[PDB]
Every structure is written in structure tokens, then in C-alpha cells.
């Protein structure tokens, strides 16, 4: 975009300061963040003395 | 016309099954 | 802001199309939305002779 090879980058591009200094972003169309991913809590094997 | 740039990133931008048949 | 009485507004101000038309917004400093609110579940204390 800075070199003119594209007009608009409609992609999941994160609005950040470094990028913001050279291009301009629209208002966010999608807000996200860091998150935790775990395996679904499968049923436990019955313990001795259950 | 304009030059819209993106990346291959499911489900943001995904190729259809018939991408070899259709090119646009 | 629009009529010049103030030079910047730094209160919690929603970013909307109507407002964006006449003034300038920075990128969001706080993302939020509508959400549900209820009373705490209030765990029951069993009776002695329950
Ligand atoms: C013939 C054969 C012999 C048999 C002998 C039967 C004997 C009967 C004795 C029973 C004693 C009752 C104690 C008591 O009232 O418990 C109190 C707890 O408060 C305490 O913590 C109790 C303190 C220890 C009790 C010591 C004996 C609460 O009790 P409550 O207020 O009465 O309960 C109504 C409300 N509730 C159900 C929501 C709690
Ligand atoms: O820009 C805006 N920002 C706002 C920010 C807040 C809050 F976050 F709470 F501070 C509130 N509320 C104050 C008390 O009621 C609950 C929330 C209203 C706002 N409104 C008016 P609304 O659109 O009628 O809600 C705006 O217009």
C-alpha cells in the first residue's frame, strides 16, 4: 500500500502504531484479543476409591 | 477498478472448490 | 467540539457514524458492548434439619 501496488487491504490487519505511522486504518471492523484454548473437558476415568 | 489486496486466511479469505475453473 | 467551545473531548464517547461525520475520532481506547446483568447466584445454605 505504501508503494502503491494496492488500493485497500481488506484483510485481518491489526491496527498498530508502527503500521499506523505509514498507512491509515479505518475504524476497527472487528475487535479481538489473546485468548486461551483448551481441550473440551472429557469425562474422567473413574479413580480407585471413587 | 481498484486493487484489493488480501491474504489466504480461513475464514477471512478462502478459495472456492471451483477456483481452477473460474478465475476472477 | 463542532462549535469551537472546546478543543478536545476525553470522556467515554461512543464512535458512531453520525458523530464521525462532523468531528474526528481517535482509534478506540476502550472496546465494549451490550451485556447481560443478573444477581449473583446466591448459593443456598442448607437447613440443619434438611
Ligand atoms: C428419644 C431419643 C433422643 C433423641 C435426642 C435428641 C436431642 C436433640 C438435640 C438437637 C439439637 C438442636 C440444635 C439446633 O437447634 O440447631 C441449630 C443450629 O445451631 C447449632 O449449631 C447447634 C449446636 C449444637 C447442638 C448440640 C446438641 C438450628 O436449629 P433450628 O433453628 O431449630 O432449626 C430450624 C431452622 N433451620 C432448619 C433452618 C436450621
Ligand atoms: O457516547 C456515549 N457514551 C455513553 C457512555 C455511557 C457510559 F459508559 F455509561 F459511561 C453511557 N451510560 C451512562 C449511564 O447509563 C449507562 C451507560 C451512555 C453513553 N451515551 C448515551 P447512550 O447512547 O444513550 O447510552 C453516549 O451517547
Cα shape of chain A: rod-shaped
Measured by DSSP, the beta-strand proportion of chain A falls in: under 5%
Oligomer: part of a larger assembly
- Number of helical regions of chain A: 1
Radius of gyration of chain A: 22 Å
The bound ligands are: the ligand CCCCCCCC/C=C\CCCCCCCC(=O)O[C@@H](COC(=O)CCCCCCCCCCCCCCC)COP(=O)([O-])OCC[N+](C)(C)C, the ligand O=c1[nH]c2cc(C(F)(F)F)c(N3CCOCC3)cc2n(CP(=O)(O)O)c1=O
Q: Largest interface, with Cβ-Cβ < 8 Å? A: A-B, 9 and 9 residues
Helix vs. strand class of chain A = little secondary structure
Order of helices and strands of chain A: H
Give the end-to-end Cα distance of chain A, rounded to a whole number of Å.
63 Å
Estimated helix fraction of chain A: under 10%
Q: Let me know the number of strands of chain A.
A: 0
Protein name (chain B): Glutamate receptor 2
Family (chain B): Belongs to the glutamate-gated ion channel (TC 1.A.10.1) family. GRIA2 subfamily.
Organism (chain B): Rattus norvegicus
Subcellular location (chain B): Cell membrane; Postsynaptic cell membrane; Postsynaptic density membrane
Q: Could you explain how this protein is built, in words?
A:
This is part of a larger assembly, with three copies of chain A. The first copy, chain A, has 50 residues and is mostly loops. Chain A is 8% helix and 0% strand. The first copy, chain A, has one helix spanning 17-20. Chains A and B meet through loops of A and loops of B. Residues 47-49 of chain C line the site of ligand POV. Chain B: It comes from Rattus norvegicus (Rat). Chain B: It is found in: Cell membrane; Postsynaptic cell membrane; Postsynaptic density membrane. Chain B: Belongs to the glutamate-gated ion channel (TC 1.A.10.1) family. GRIA2 subfamily. Chain B: This is Glutamate receptor 2.
Amino acid at each position: 500500500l505504501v508503494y502503491g501496488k494496492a488500493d485497500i487491504a481488506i484483510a485481518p490487519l491489526t491496527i498498530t502504531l508502527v503500521r499506523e505511522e505509514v498507512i491509515d486504518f479505518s475504524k476497527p471492523f472487528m475487535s479481538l484479543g489473546i485468548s486461551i484454548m483448551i481441550k473440551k473437558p472429557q469425562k474422567s476415568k473413574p479413580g480407585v476409591f471413587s | 477498478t481498484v486493487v484489493v489486496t488480501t491474504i489466504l486466511e480461513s475464514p477471512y479469505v478462502m478459495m472456492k472448490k471451483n477456483h481452477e475453473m473460474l478465475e476472477g
